[PDB]
Amino acid sequence: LKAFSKHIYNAYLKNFNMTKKKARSILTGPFVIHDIETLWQAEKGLVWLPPYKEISVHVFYRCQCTTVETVRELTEFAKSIPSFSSLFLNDQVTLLKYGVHEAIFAMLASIVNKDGLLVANGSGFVTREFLRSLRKPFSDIIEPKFEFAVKFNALELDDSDLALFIAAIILCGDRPGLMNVPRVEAIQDTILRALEFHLQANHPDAQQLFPKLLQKMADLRQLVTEHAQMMQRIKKTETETSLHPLLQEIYKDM
Amino acid sequence: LKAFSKHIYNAYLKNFNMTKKKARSILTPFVIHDIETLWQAEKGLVWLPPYKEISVHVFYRCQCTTVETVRELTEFAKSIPSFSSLFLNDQVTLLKYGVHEAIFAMLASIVNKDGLLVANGSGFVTREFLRSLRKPFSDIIEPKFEFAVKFNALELDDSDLALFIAAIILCGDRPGLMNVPRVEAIQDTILRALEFHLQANHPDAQQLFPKLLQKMADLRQLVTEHAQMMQRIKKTETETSLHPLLQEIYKDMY
Ligand SMILES: CCCc1c(OCCCOc2ccc(OCC(=O)O)cc2)ccc(C(C)=O)c1O
Numbered sequence: 001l002k003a004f005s006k007h008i009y010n011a012y013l014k015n016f017n018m019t020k021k022k023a024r025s026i027l028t029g030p031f032v033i034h035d036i037e038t039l040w041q042a043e044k045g046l047v048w049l050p051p052y053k054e055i056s057v058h059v060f061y062r063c064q065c066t067t068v069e070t071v072r073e074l075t076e077f078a079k080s081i082p083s084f085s086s087l088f089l090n091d092q093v094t095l096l097k098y099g100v101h102e103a104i105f106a107m108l109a110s111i112v113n114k115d116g117l118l119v120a121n122g123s124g125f126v127t128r129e130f131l132r133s134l135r136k137p138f139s140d141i142i143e144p145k146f147e148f149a150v151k152f153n154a155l156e157l158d159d160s161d162l163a164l165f166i167a168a169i170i171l172c173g174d175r176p177g178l179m180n181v182p183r184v185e186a187i188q189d190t191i192l193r194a195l196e197f198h199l200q201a202n203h204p205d206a207q208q209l210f211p212k213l214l215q216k217m218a219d220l221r222q223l224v225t226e227h228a229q230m231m232q233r234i235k236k237t238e239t240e241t242s243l244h245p246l247l248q249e250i251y252k253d254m
Numbered sequence: 255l256k257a258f259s260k261h262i263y264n265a266y267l268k269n270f271n272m273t274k275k276k277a278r279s280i281l282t283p284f285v286i287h288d289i290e291t292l293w294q295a296e297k298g299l300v301w302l303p304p305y306k307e308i309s310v311h312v313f314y315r316c317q318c319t320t321v322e323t324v325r326e327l328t329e330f331a332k333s334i335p336s337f338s339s340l341f342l343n344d345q346v347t348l349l350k351y352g353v354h355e356a357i358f359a360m361l362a363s364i365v366n367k368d369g370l371l372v373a374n375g376s377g378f379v380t381r382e383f384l385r386s387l388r389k390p391f392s393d394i395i396e397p398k399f400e401f402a403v404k405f406n407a408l409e410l411d412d413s414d415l416a417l418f419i420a421a422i423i424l425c426g427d428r429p430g431l432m433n434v435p436r437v438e439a440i441q442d443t444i445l446r447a448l449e450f451h452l453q454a455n456h457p458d459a460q461q462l463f464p465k466l467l468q469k470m471a472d473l474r475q476l477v478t479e480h481a482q483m484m485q486r487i488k489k490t491e492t493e494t495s496l497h498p499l500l501q502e503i504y505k506d507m508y
């Protein structure tokens with residue numbers, strides 16, 4: 001269990017290009033993108049796909065590049081978890097399908113602060129204000145991740161906690177159309193039971209931390225649901241803006 | 255390209271326990287041709303739902319072998335050069351619609367005019383006995399023999415088969431494929447690989463390549479017939495269970 005927990009931690013450290021440790025250090029605990037000018041400045045070099053069109057739509061496409069890229073890292077992370085690799089690829093896909101966004105928003109907390117978040121592997125900092133100035137459609141689907149992040153960061157988890165927490169979110173028996181539910185619920189339980197002992201060791205004086213995170217997991221489920229509805233409104237009202245094919249397959253039935 | 259072949263041949267040699275050139279040795283095995291011999295193999299030849307009847311029990315043996323071959327193929331495909339780069343969801347699509355095609359192809363390696371090997375060649379079930387099975391199960395089996403016999407006439411070895419098999423999995427025509435161009439390109443290389451490989455390994459033979467491409471189409475018609483028959487069995491043959499995985503593959507075939 002303590003060994004299983006370390007194993008999950010190593011899979012996390014090996015598969016993610018950005019850990020919270022780094023994130024918090026960079027954010028002192030990076031080019032500031034706060035308007036059209038600075039974002040253009042960032043796109044050229046200081047920092048850094050479909051043809052342009054407008055600021056709000058261009059930032060949405062960056063969210064997509066980022067999320068798809070994180071989905072690739074979550075796939076390798078899960079695959080680096082022996083039990084998960086045992087399931088038939090179909091169940092592996094079902095789990096990733098319904099869990100990556102929940103996992104992405106939990107991890108977004110690592111690179112977020114009351115004022116904004118980092119982008120392009122820590123090189124840039126996009127202000128929450130700027131993101132707020134965007135067109136209503138896009139500005140409102142972004143804001144809630146912040147509200148959840150700030151609150152999430154107050155629990156002060158480290159990469160070791162997050163590794164277990166993220167594995168738990170992915171290995172969930174609830175997901176639509178899962179084939180081997182028992183097997184899955186069993187892997188999660190083992191994960192949760194290891195998180196249980198890990199927190200007691202890592203955060204000795206934090207009371208109620210564990211049941212607090214289970215609630216955070218339920219919270220993430222509601223955050224994604226609302227994210228998905230907003231994603232549906234964008235596919236319906238934003239005729240000119242596209243959506244990466246991989247993201248159309250996830251929101252296919254969500 | 256010479257390496258590519260050689261690299262797919264090894265992935266085939268370590269992922270598949272039973273190879274044609276091995277099934278050929280132990281065939282130049284306990285003979286199972288009736289209920290008593292099957293009984294003793296099930297006791298002796300230590301290779302499932304409670305014993306129903308002989309016809310159904312043999313049907314369950316097919317599923318068992320079929321489900322385990324899917325396990326192998328999954329690992330094999332994952333060894334194929336660019337296969338693993340494809341997003342999991344496409345990997346699942348390719349496996350879903352290709353595994354039976356692959357399976358019925360490899361089946362030829364262990365097939366005879368008079369029967370086939372089972373449980374790592376320790377057993378051999380006669381074709382006549384399978385033909386003696388109750389009305390529905392006997393009819394879905396026989397056609398694999400008819401196809402296998404003609405296929406063995408091409409006298410291919412394990413090196414050829416490895417490319418032929420990878421070529422069947424990497425098919426850009428499968429319904430619901432996300433990155434079609436990507437798959438089509440990986441398939442082309444496999445084919446050109448198969449192309450040159452056949453030149454060195456079977457210089458004498460004429461029209462072998464066009465022959466094989468036609469075999470791939472035949473295999474496509476074989477599974478369609480197979481899936482229909484399976485659908486009928488899942489309908490009229492109530493009380494006969496179907497492995498959940500096999501249920502996921504067939505659910506969307508017509
Ligand atoms: C995970 C995306 C992280 C992110 C931003 O997050 C905002 C909070 C998250 O907001 C969204 C997340 C995803 C999204 O759509 C894609 C999807 O839902 O899969 C839309 C909004 C905002 C800007 C950038 C830039 C400039 O590079 C960025 O990389």
Ligand SMILES: CCCc1c(OCCCOc2ccc(OCC(=O)O)cc2)ccc(C(C)=O)c1O
Nearest residue numbers: 312315316317319320372379394395398484500
């Ligand atoms: C590939 C299965 C190979 C096989 C047999 O093949 C008959 C030709 C293939 O026939 C079928 C293949 C699969 C099948 O259903 C399962 C599926 O469609 O996936 C039904 C018939 C017959 C008997 C056995 C035993 C006694 O162990 C066996 O392992």
